[PDB]
Design an enzyme around this catalytic site. Structure first.
Site, mmCIF file in Angstrom:
data_model
loop_
_atom_site.group_PDB
_atom_site.id
_atom_site.type_symbol
_atom_site.label_atom_id
_atom_site.label_comp_id
_atom_site.label_asym_id
_atom_site.label_seq_id
_atom_site.Cartn_x
_atom_site.Cartn_y
_atom_site.Cartn_z
ATOM 1 N N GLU A 133 0.873 -1.310 0.016
ATOM 2 C CA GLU A 133 -0.042 -0.075 0.012
ATOM 3 C C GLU A 133 0.868 1.357 0.091
ATOM 4 O OE1 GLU A 133 -3.331 0.021 2.893
ATOM 5 O OE2 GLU A 133 -4.142 -1.758 1.839
ATOM 6 N N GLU A 240 -5.716 -8.034 -0.749
ATOM 7 C CA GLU A 240 -6.570 -7.720 0.743
ATOM 8 C C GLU A 240 -7.944 -7.386 0.322
ATOM 9 O OE1 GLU A 240 -5.133 -4.836 3.513
ATOM 10 O OE2 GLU A 240 -3.007 -5.804 3.203
#
Ligand SMILES: O=[N+]([O-])c1ccc(O[C@@H]2O[C@H](CO)[C@@H](O)[C@H](O)[C@H]2O)c(Cl)c1
Length: 305
Positions: A133, A240
């Site tokens: 991320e 995710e």
């Protein structure tokens, strides 16, 4: 049999207590439980993503030597996953930052990645994930860091392994096309790049509420990314995703995965966030036997396993 190339769970814990560096194993952080991973493998999951902190694995300077004790537990966690035939994703859960500063040196990042890859180069079931991320940082830099990671990994002779690359904007699928187009240009002599995108289903996409926007929000939020992957000749994975243990989210999850099953030319699979031994009553806990997601979401994931 299985619908996707990969379907499984994050195994979180080694990145916990990130405010405490190096931190103390068993107090600030903990590694995944090989026995509960074994349970998830028995249910048919074949991929486990293992977050860890760059600073705990390679302290002080990312060009330096690894910390032997933290590395030992990473190796133990990985090699146990792979001894069963499942894939282990090595994830420096670092947001493009090291000691909370943007990683602005691709060459330093390349050295870090040669160091890590050299510890796993003969294990074909390891997957290297460049960083979790990236966000709030220069877009060309994100491209360059991903490329530096690939270059470092392959320079170590780790050529059999898939590399999960991640984009800016928290590698979100819903913002992929407008933010991360430049990621099309990444190169890999092994031809094993997978574009890892994340997708949560709450109002803001932060994955902090158990409430989902609607029963179709997952499919809605990954559709444009699906078209970008196909048009650009790339492959992707949802690294995710999560939703609360409730009807709207369960329907969104099923709808997303069903859409993804219709697009396996680009989608290699999906990885739930998260299992791990220190989640307690976490709204998304996949940890056997009592995590709420293990109790109420796993029955809707088994159709894909
Ligand atoms: O694209 N957005 O509008 C958006 C993306 C991400 C957001 O929150 C972040 O979500 C991450 C997971 O998707 C999480 O790891 C991070 O801590 C959040 O800040 C928002 Cl709010 C919006």
């Amino acid at each position: 049999a299985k619908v996707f190339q990969w379907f499984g769970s994050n195994e979180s814990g080694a990145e916990f207590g990130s405010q405490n560096l190096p931190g103390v194993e068993g107090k600030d952080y903990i590694w995944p439980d090989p026995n509960t991973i074994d349970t998830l493998i028995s249910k048919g999951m074949n991929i486990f993503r293992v977050p860890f902190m760059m600073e705990r694995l390679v302290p002080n300077s990312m060009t330096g030597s690894p910390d032997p004790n933290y590395l030992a537990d990473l190796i133990a966690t990985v090699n146990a996953i792979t001894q069963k035939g499942a894939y282990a994703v090595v994830d420096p859960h670092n947001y493009g930052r090291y000691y909370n500063s943007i990683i602005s040196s691709p060459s330093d990042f390349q050295t870090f990645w040669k160091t890590v890859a050299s510890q796993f180069a003969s294990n074909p079931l390891v997957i290297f994930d460049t960083n979790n991320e990236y966000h709030d940082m220069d877009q060309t830099l994100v491209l360059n860091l991903n490329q530096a990671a690939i270059d470092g990994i392959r320079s170590a002779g780790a050529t059999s392994q898939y590399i999960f690359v991640e984009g800016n904007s928290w590698t979100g699928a819903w913002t992929w096309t407008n933010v991360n187009d430049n990621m099309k240009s990444l190169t890999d002599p092994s031809d094993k790049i997978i574009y890892e995108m994340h997708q949560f289903l709450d109002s803001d996409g932060s994955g902090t509420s158990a409430t989902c926007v609607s029963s179709t929000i997952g499919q809605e939020r990954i559709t444009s990314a699906t078209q970008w992957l196909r048009a650009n000749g790339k492959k992707g994975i949802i690294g995710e995703f999560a939703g609360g243990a409730n009807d709207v989210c369960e329907t969104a999850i099923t709808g997303m995965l069903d859409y993804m099953a219709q697009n396996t030319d680009v989608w290699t699979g999906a990885i739930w966030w998260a299992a791990g031994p220190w989640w307690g009553d976490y709204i998304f806990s996949m940890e056997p036997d009592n995590g709420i997601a293990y109790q109420q979401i796993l029955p809707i994931l088994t159709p894909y396993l």
